[PDB]
Amino acid sequence: SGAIYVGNYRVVNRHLATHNDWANLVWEDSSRDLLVSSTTAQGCDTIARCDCQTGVYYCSSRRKHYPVSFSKPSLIFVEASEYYPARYQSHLMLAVGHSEPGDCGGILRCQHGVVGIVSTGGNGLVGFADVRDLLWLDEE
């Protein structure tokens, strides 16, 4: 689990969104595994606006924050899971590291702010859904 809180927006993994998130939906994309909903209170997170390929992510299944090198956002084949059939997921970045399904939502951050959230894993790899291209998260 986990979310990003920026301005009056809440960013979560689409597969973990609640009834309230869908009722207050701003934008969602199944191919990215992302959903953004509106909030009443102001958030305190800052979204990175950069092309960084190094950062730190939180891994709940190890209670640890790991420094990682990660790939640029791309279209990557993701195996079938409990929440989606086998498909290509877009805007996905991979790193060598540990990930289990319940780790989804863990933040990846660089010196500029939040880069994305954990979304995939397996085979000693961890994948993150990028949010740095969602420029509208910085306004209204």
Ligand SMILES: NC(=O)[C@H]1CCC(=O)N(Cc2cccc3c2OCC3)C1
């Ligand atoms: N973005 C997706 O398609 C998600 C949907 C929910 C989900 O359980 N997975 C599989 C998954 C995620 C993280 C870690 C691991 C996983 O499988 C093995 C280790 C993929």
Ligand SMILES: [Zn+2]
């Ligand atoms: Zn950065």
